[model samples]
Target: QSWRKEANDRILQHRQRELVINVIDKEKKPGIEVEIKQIRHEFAFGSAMNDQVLFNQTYADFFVQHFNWAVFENEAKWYANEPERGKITYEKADAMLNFANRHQIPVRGHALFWEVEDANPNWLKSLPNHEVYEAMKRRLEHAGNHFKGKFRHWDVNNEMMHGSFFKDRFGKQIWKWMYEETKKIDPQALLFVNDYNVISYGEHHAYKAHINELRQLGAPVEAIGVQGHFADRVDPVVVKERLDVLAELGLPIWVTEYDSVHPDANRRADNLEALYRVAFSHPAVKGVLMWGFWAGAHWRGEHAAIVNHDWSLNEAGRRYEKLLQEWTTQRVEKTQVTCPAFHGTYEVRIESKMLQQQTIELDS
Candidate 1:
């Protein structure tokens, strides 16, 4: 009291002095623990075309969505390899391979030598038999040397079964010569014998016979490439039957250049989806390369694409996206287990009785 007050003053404030008691309550809940199973599947997406701009743009999206393992297309044959004898120009094809390499996708060379009147240059068509063979051999060597390591697979001969140009010019042994010569330049490349109309009931049997004969003769064949351009009236049963036959060859089969072309657009999507499901499920069918995925971008005017010109997803596109998602994703689940007794530092026991179950695992 006697001392003077300091320059600073202390203050205390209280809002209420009433005595009150508040009660809080908590609730306990029980949950049932369940286990879930997941499966892993593999798939591929590709398109066949000669349009560089469209291919680059479409494949960019293709890789983004599916991360395809292989790509197949056309027009990289003698037309681009050697437009003229002894002159090699790969500008367009090079652009394609460069884009594929950038995306880490493998390229399937459409055809090295398509022994067809339309595929052979007019300059070589008029030459003598032996001279034409020499020209063709030189073209193969040139293309194989230039694109040796860039391409992962090669269609050494395309549609050779349907055409007679090889028989008329290079005799019956033309396939053997083509395979041997192509391998000489690129021994590691997978060589394929490609053909269309081979999936039909009438022609499929003969096609398989011819392929087996070539293999028996040691034609350096690695796979059977069947162009599955199903017509408007494609039957899933017939497709399965043809696949079964091709599987017997014991060589990898590819659904190369696949598309459902029908005058009726309504049936195309459903038919294509069914055929694709069967093809993907087939053990020997390794890959499916679509013919086109963009309307007005296909070589033909038919509506075979998954996306229309308006950039809208068609029925095929929706189903394809669904399939791709199912093929790529790995689902997982967790659950807590209760036992009669708990043991510290215990080892977990696991067993699988099915092939599908073998791929699953758990962790704590």
Candidate 2:
């Protein structure tokens, strides 16, 4: 990642030189609003919805107010389904799903399967190799059926293009079976292949090809989930090139599981904004979800946190707030304006609290 930082620095300097040669430069610090077009498609800004840590009034209150979508941290997974040595574990996942539904917040099911062995419960692995595939099938069936209509998106396979710990035992068709079964259970879900290092580490080329191969094999992959796990500020051009390659699939794209790992808050915030600008501007990408947003609960703790652990807004948090309020939201109080509009059923209450609560005349 440090080498990547060094590489990006060189690219940035080269681009600067190009700008000098052409005497062409922009007037504004590029923001999400600089996407050429004001907006397109429905966009959702989301974060990890961890029921365990969010119960503290500070974070709980902040969460529902800020994020429109979520990915459950430990919820909605195989282990969460059955944490103990028993058969089914639904309490943790069910609880989080309930909370999300109650708030009218949409969710992207974190995963149906993760290849890592430690992430798998011993009970699931304890099954004879012959029966493991059936267990996987049942797990998907139960989860897909239980949360079918409630979830808008689901990561059908987590990080599978790179590895499959169970493939050797179950045969490579394990993935084929999972996809076909997932489709049968919930045909409407925009199932995605979620993975890390898609762009930042130059793995997206392989990831893109892998998904196409899955489609050719008759798997119904409806979306692509690029886990934006950045170790430093990423080069925006690098972001664009990778996304362009994946766009050939002509499916929805989501910047799912995005997180910044830089220690410097300033650079982290800068990287966050740059990443967001590129993701939002892309025609294929529809939504962006932060892996976690709070220091107390984030995957990287303070390093990846936008808000401080005590539920206070950090510099990154403030910058994100500005994006949500300034770029994504619209407010018009004056008679006329030139700014682009947000697409939604808006409530315009033209009333004011003054010394006498004046002006209630309508020409119409």
Candidate 3:
């Protein structure tokens, strides 16, 4: 209960900035009306977009309306890209990348390598250790160069806590090489080591130790990703406690794949609100993205999606929309006004004979 006060206080302290708009008129007009409107957020809020967006107009429209950042649900995975060895394809990924670029949305590369065996191509699994090492290096070189600097962040290797297909074969140095080569190829993109259960459990000592070890080994671990997936009720207090633990790393933290699974629609809506409030309030947290939002496309089942099958807002979807609206700011004031506003791009318009207009960016 006390977290409410702290949350609100932290939000005001960390999420807002002062904007000063000055209007100069040759006639020295009095009582000029000025309007300030926010166009986009400095913080990222988005979801997992899939191939259906390329063909389904309804899906595409909803995505652009709600999200500013995106991660390909399965289109950018190793298995999806190279189903058979020596046969690589990027048709689907390229089309999807172009779509997001047109909408001016930044994407996160879901993974350059996945440590789990199931996500790897079957042909690669059958190879000997020497052959496996050769294949792994080639895969990294191909992906790192093919989409160079296009993605905002790259999951250097995903789900490190749950899998060890690469580590068990090539040892710890293999992990450092993936980060090193990726940095050499695409210097601008932030490299992240993604994993799950750290936020929900709050005591993932193994995962924390692994991150420390990566840094000790001189890996260019620029950011951290905690997969915020919940299969039951959410406790905001627990979420904050866990975020506090990760904040010690001193790197930007992003709730990469957030989703709630509940049988009851009302419960699901409440869960989303609870998690979002805590994540937004934390100073170390930078972004929060839903794993997937539509029932027809979600991997875990319909209950995991906020939107229903008929292209309408379920109880949870409505809550999601309202939260975004709560974060946005729009106001009308007299000329030469100074006030607090959310961190984003704003347009200040003055109501006068010529209707003066100016654009400004307020960053945190």
Candidate 4:
């Protein structure tokens, strides 16, 4: 009876051992190790344009605690800055900046110049073309100087290719002016030309043309900012082609605004995960900023936000966390067993020949 019981126990142990998953390490592969800093996330608000209460309450401390990075109010550009012309009420901007600074979260200025009606103040539209130019310069000089070292980066221009404001105003000189003025205020700051059409359609002709023109004229532009606000049916292949085109410039790439507006939550989540994986895998893409995390405060109508209206993280958010953890570290587990003949010191290797090697040890 004792012999039979012992044999049965041994069989059970063997089965349990077979169920265990072991990860071992092999020889390390040689390659340049790119240190990815904390993954970027965004907390945004809609009433941030004029309501400090909503902005401060909805985003302030929550963002500070959850995210290490932030982006400014989209309407806080020329329109909100000089809403009354020469009367720049920076109270809202100051509140947002102070909140970020107090929490040690890096903030990004949404934009300095773009020729869109929504982005333009009513007073500015009535001004002459040349005055509009001067107003832009003033806005940049003031805002850039005020938040000199605080902002991680500045979208010196947003959606220039899709919009006609800059092209019509400064012609080819728009890029030169923005770069020159911004550098004057903060020479070490990173300046980026942000746009949306670059992701799906590939190199937007207007943006590419302007960038080329600026380079030829010796502009101080440093990076390209692509907004990956994908629709329901985003083609990853097309997105890759767009990214490749921007990569050709040999400048750092930032996915400044990212979100998907598809109604199907499952598909949206899957597509978002795929998009994030592709963007992060690229050598040049430095960071990806989701447009918003919560539904109520999202910019697009029922489109973006990883968290639903009830404050619960959606399936997408859960998957995002899982993927983030997988990218950052190795998971581990252990098994226990009793075996008279299993006493040994085993050196285990876990290796991906195409990538790197990691090692572990087991003592029995």
| Candidates sorted by lDDT, best first | 3, 2, 1, 4
**Highest lDDT, which number?**
3
Which pairs clash in the backbone of model 1? none
lDDT against true structure, model 3: 0.84
**Model 1 C-alpha lDDT per residue in residues 121-145, reported as the tens digit of each score:** 7777778888887877677777779
Lowest summed lDDT window (length 10), candidate 1: 7-16
Q: For model 3, what is the alpha-carbon lDDT of residue 1? A: 72
Q: Residue by residue across 236-273, what tens digits does model 3's lDDT show?
A: 88888888878888988899998888888899998898
Per-residue lDDT of model 2, residues 1-364, tens digit only: 4534543453233211110011113553311211112222136788887865336777777888778888888877788776764467667777777777788788888788887676787787667876777777677787879878767888877888666677767665777777888888888777888888887779988988889888887888888999898886777778878888988889878898888877777887878777876776676777899988888878777888888877777778888888765544334433212223343222222322111111122110
How would you encode candidate 4's per-residue C-alpha lDDT over 1-364 as one tens digit per residue?
A: 3433443353233211111222233543222222212122222111122233244465444454345567775545777778788998677778777766676667777777775665778888778888887887788878888778877677887776667766776676776777787888888688888888678555555566667767787678788878877777566556656676777778877777777887777777887766666665455676677776667677885556666776677787677667555443222222221222211122222322222221122322
TM-score of each: 0.76, 0.80, 0.94, 0.73
Instruction: Assess candidate 2 and give its TM-score to the true structure.
Output: 0.80
Candidate 1 error regions (>4 Å):
1-42, 54-59, 62-72, 263-265, 335-364
C-alpha lDDT of candidate 4 relative to the true structure: 0.61
Candidate 2, superposed: residue stretches over 4 Å from native: 1-41, 333-339, 348-364
Count clashing residue pairs per candidate.
Answer: 0, 1, 0, 7
Q: What overall lDDT goes with each candidate model? A: 0.64, 0.70, 0.84, 0.61
Predicted model with the maximum TM-score: 3
Candidate RMSDs in order: 21.0, 11.0, 3.1, 13.4
